[PDB]
Design an enzyme around this catalytic site. Structure first.
Site, PDB file in Angstrom:
ATOM      1  N   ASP A  35       0.828  -1.197   0.000  1.00 26.26           N
ATOM      2  CA  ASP A  35       0.000   0.000   0.000  1.00 26.26           C
ATOM      3  C   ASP A  35       0.869   1.257   0.000  1.00 26.26           C
ATOM      4  OD1 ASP A  35      -1.913   1.898   0.329  1.00 26.26           O
ATOM      5  OD2 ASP A  35      -2.414   1.370   2.417  1.00 26.26           O
ATOM      6  N   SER A 199      -0.568  15.497 -12.177  1.00 26.18           N
ATOM      7  CA  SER A 199      -0.815  15.121 -13.556  1.00 26.18           C
ATOM      8  C   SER A 199      -1.050  16.374 -14.386  1.00 26.18           C
ATOM      9  CB  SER A 199      -2.023  14.176 -13.628  1.00 26.18           C
ATOM     10  OG  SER A 199      -2.437  13.919 -14.953  1.00 26.18           O
TER      11      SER A 199
END
EC number: 3.4.23.22
Length: 330
Positions: A35, A199
């Site tokens: 994770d 992004s």
């Protein structure tokens, strides 16, 4: 040193991935959920409340000659999905794919929430976010990656998650045969303890690319892709019959639909998520309403590039003094 371990979807939907981890001496192998959105290595154990264990493999520290109680240390974690667990702490030898760390904090669960009990395939979590998020008190502990880092050939790990198929976590090297083209690297902020990056935009299907900054985290422990409501609405508007359902808890679509791809930007590069990756199947057994793999982050407070996005790429988690993230197509 290096390590390399295969990671395997827990079910036919790729709801999560499990990777075998050797703990203790002799080894006890548990299948952990790696994770990158948290920083605790915790396991089902011989100390876990019996009614809260249902099919998981447990770690029994009393059977490990290298286990030592970390005196006075406790831990307690709550995840974004509302699940939680808590307990005490041992140090022990932990190996992943041939890479061994001695003195790793192994957080033994005394209590786990129902979501964990109900998932027989996940024996615990192995956190790979920054150690500043580790919950051990009164002395915070380091992640497996942080402990291994100085010994690694290169201070990196990579995630290569499969679509309906196994994939790989590598530690200490970049497998140049595992991706196509080049890896594009992008800046990381560690201010919130996550692999947080920006992004450069998105496209829906064969549509034009929208240049826009989207701050979010690379999180292998989250199933879906959670993005701003504007972006998500633009995606689902291209699927006939798709709608946001408050009763179901997100966007649903007719199971008869063919989903468009979704592209996200990494610098000047582009990662394409095929439409099929966005299908999470019937909302309930036998339903013709299917659950979407791209969902709104509104009210999460952060955008999350979860498995839906990451499995479309070969992803480098570069833990150099200034960390960065790399993405390649594959």
């Amino acid at each position: 040193s290096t390590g390399s371990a295969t990671t395997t979807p827990i079910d036919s939907l790729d709801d999560a991935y499990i990777t075998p981890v050797q703990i203790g001496t002799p080894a006890q192998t548990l299948n952990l959920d790696f994770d990158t959105g948290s920083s605790d290595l915790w396991v089902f154990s011989s100390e876990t409340t019996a009614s809260e264990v249902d099919g998981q493999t447990i770690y029994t520290p009393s059977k490990s000659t290298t286990a030592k109680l970390l005196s006075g240390a406790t831990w307690s974690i709550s995840y974004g999905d509302g699940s939680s667990s808590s307990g005490d702490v041992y140090t022990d030898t932990v190996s992943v794919g041939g890479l061994t760390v001695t003195g790793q904090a192994v957080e033994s669960a005394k209590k786990v929430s129902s979501s964990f009990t109900e998932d027989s395939t996940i024996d615990g979590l192995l956190g790979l976010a920054f150690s500043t998020l580790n919950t051990v008190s009164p002395t915070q502990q380091k992640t497996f990656f942080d402990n291994a880092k100085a010994s690694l050939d290169s201070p990196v790990f990579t995630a290569d998650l499969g679509y309906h198929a196994p994939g790989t976590y590598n530690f200490g090297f970049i497998d140049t045969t595992a991706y196509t083209g080049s890896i594009t690297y992008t800046a990381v902020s560690t201010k919130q303890g996550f692999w947080e990056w920006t992004s450069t935009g998105y496209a829906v299907g064969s549509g034009t690319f929208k240049s826009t900054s989207i701050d979010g985290i690379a999180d292998t422990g989250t199933t879906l892709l959670y993005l701003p409501a504007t972006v998500v609405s633009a995606y689902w508007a291209q699927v006939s019959g798709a709608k946001s359902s408050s009763s179901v808890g997100g966007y649903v679509f007719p199971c008869s639909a063919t989903l468009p791809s979704f592209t996200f930007g990494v610098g000047s590069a582009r990662i394409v998520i095929p439409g099929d990756y966005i299908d999470f199947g019937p909302i309930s057994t036998g339903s013709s309403s299917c659950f979407g793999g791209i969902q709104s982050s509104a009210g999460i407070g952060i955008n999350i590039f979860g498995d839906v996005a990451l499995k479309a790429a070969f992803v480098v988690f570069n833990g150099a003094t200034t960390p960065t993230l790399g993405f390649a197509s594959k």
